[PDB]
Enzyme design. Structure first.
Site, short mmCIF file in Angstrom:
data_model
loop_
_atom_site.label_atom_id
_atom_site.label_comp_id
_atom_site.label_asym_id
_atom_site.label_seq_id
_atom_site.Cartn_x
_atom_site.Cartn_y
_atom_site.Cartn_z
N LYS A 161 14.33 -7.30 17.01
CA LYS A 161 14.11 -8.31 15.86
C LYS A 161 14.98 -7.83 14.66
CE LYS A 161 9.78 -8.14 16.96
NZ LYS A 161 8.48 -8.43 17.21
N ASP A 202 1.91 -6.89 20.52
CA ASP A 202 1.33 -8.18 20.11
C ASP A 202 0.84 -9.10 21.27
OD1 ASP A 202 4.38 -10.01 18.59
OD2 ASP A 202 3.95 -8.54 20.42
#
Ligand SMILES: Cn1ccnc1Sc1cc(C(=O)Nc2nccs2)c(N)cc1F
Ligand SMILES: OC[C@H]1O[C@H](O)[C@H](O)[C@@H](O)[C@@H]1O
Ligand code: NA
Length: 448
Positions: free
Chosen positions: A156, A192
């Protein structure tokens, strides 16, 4: 039709989806086996979060969340409900991620983090306390245990040197001690996906899958211990972090990749990695549309073939623009304003065309993603002896939650691919914060 012919390149037939789905299930199997776990594109990382081993310590926990471009710190209260434990965010705070904090070193990165953890403590008259710390760290991590694991590599966009390969928990403490200003007790570190799954569980005991479709894209699910060959033991169940974002990194998706995909990948901070994710994630969606728009201009089919200064600059077309464009009521006001801000003066047809480019790119994300989840659900289906398997999926992320129709398309496509399955989707309310805390509360009945 000249324009629709170019956009048609984004289409995916049901057969293409079933093929991507089968390949995902095949890579998942490869990531689990000892003999292929090392070269597998889909890592299938054991998380050590084990099948509900009853025994939760109640109280107030601190939850850290690093993964998005906005580091968050919050306090969550865990109690004892009927279904199981209840949880709730009481205090929170967000700290933007500084520049020198990214290009710097892993040391500095967590240094700044401690500065934020402290600030949060002062501003809430609580710096004078030592509580359990649940860390939601949204990156691929190879765990040795619930409170220890090394970073395989950043994704990311993050790129702090000296991080890859070291005990993430270690770096946290190493910095927390360069303070003395405070002292926490890191009881658990989770992904997550896992945090979202856990938080939804207490809402629906049938939730055995966690999925994220935001800046990045990934999923986790409950696996039978006998299939987790990377962890000794055949009894019980453990949650696995697929890290399916790297699916395709060994050429699994080569026949589907378009010019825009190769372009996005070549200019990314991680060339050749996270290819599947580059087809879905909000970190790349807008960029994909920008590239599609640029080709349309060079073909002389958009904006009179004249591209703006901003339109030619990477990241100019933010993923949120894609979502806004698709929310346009039809008066094109929304589309016009967005393009006008990017230094363009579009016609009625230019607007409609940008609309179509967005729908093609987002619709492909939805379908590509559906094949992945369908693969996970059907794999799990093999170990579920029962007519109709009812399963719940916990989901979070801006793309999935906010994009006007992503959710809808995704649901329909997933269901088409999962025969004999009754799939329920639930969105997490502070999934990460509450999830990390709920896991710390159970693991804290051993470290506390
Ligand atoms: C999602 N699902 C379904 C059945 N078992 C599970 S996993 C699950 C795990 C935990 C949990 O905290 N597990 C831990 N294992 C080791 C340390 S903490 C939980 N508090 C609640 C759960 F639902
Ligand atoms: O935030 C969603 C996902 O983004 C990336 O794919 C990360 O590698 C993964 O660990 C995370 O779960
Ligand atoms: Na095992």
């Amino acid at each position: 039709t000249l324009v629709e012919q170019i956009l048609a390149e984004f289409q995916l037939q049901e057969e293409d989806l079933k093929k991507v789905m089968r390949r995902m299930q095949k890579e998942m199997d490869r990531g689990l086996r000892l003999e292929t776990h090392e070269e597998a594109s889909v890592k299938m990382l054991p998380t050590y979060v084990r099948s509900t081993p009853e025994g939760s310590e109640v109280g107030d926990f601190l939850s850290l969340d690093l993964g998005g471009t906005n580091f968050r710190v919050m306090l969550v209260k865990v109690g004892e409900g009927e279904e199981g434990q209840w949880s709730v965010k009481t205090k929170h705070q967000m700290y933007s991620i500084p520049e020198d904090a990214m290009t710097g070193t892993a040391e500095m990165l967590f240094d700044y983090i401690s500065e934020c953890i402290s600030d949060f403590l002062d501003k809430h008259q609580m710096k004078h306390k030592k509580l359990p710390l649940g860390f939601t760290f949204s990156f691929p991590v190879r765990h040795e245990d619930i409170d220890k694991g090394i970073l395989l590599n950043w994704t990311k966009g993050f790129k702090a040197s000296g991080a890859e390969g070291n005990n993430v928990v270690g770096l946290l403490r190493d910095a927390i001690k360069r303070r003395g200003d405070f002292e926490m007790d890191v009881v658990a570190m989770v992904n997550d996906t896992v945090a979202t799954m856990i938080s939804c569980y207490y809402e629906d005991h049938q939730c055995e899958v966690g999925m994220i479709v935001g800046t990045g894209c990934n999923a986790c699910y409950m696996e039978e211990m006998q299939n987790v060959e990377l962890v000794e033991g055949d009894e019980g169940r453990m949650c696995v972090n697929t890290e399916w974002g790297a699916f395709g990194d060994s050429g699994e998706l080569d026949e589907f990749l378009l010019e825009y995909d190769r372009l996005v990948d070549e200019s990314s901070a991680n060339p050749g990695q996270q290819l599947y994710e580059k087809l879905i994630g909000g970190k790349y969606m807008g960029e994909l549309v920008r590239l599609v728009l640029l080709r349309l201009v060079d073909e002389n089919l958009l904006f009179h073939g004249e591209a703006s200064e901003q339109l030619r600059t990477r990241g100019a077309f933010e993923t949120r623009f894609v979502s806004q464009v698709e929310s346009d009521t039809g008066d094109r006001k929304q589309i016009y304003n967005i393009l006008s801000t990017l230094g363009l003066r579009p016609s009625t047809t230019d607007c409609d065309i940008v609309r179509r480019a967005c729908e093609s790119v987002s619709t492909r994300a939805a379908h590509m993603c559906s094949a992945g989840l369908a693969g996970v659900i059907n794999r799990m289906r093999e170990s579920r002896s029962e007519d109709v398997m009812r399963i719940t999926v916990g989901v979070d992320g801006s793309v999935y939650k906010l994009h006007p129709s992503f959710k809808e398309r995704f649901h329909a496509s997933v269901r088409r691919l999962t025969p004999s399955c009754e799939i329920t989707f639930i969105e997490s309310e502070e999934g990460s914060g509450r999830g990390a805390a709920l896991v710390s509360a159970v693991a804290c009945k051993k470290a506390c």
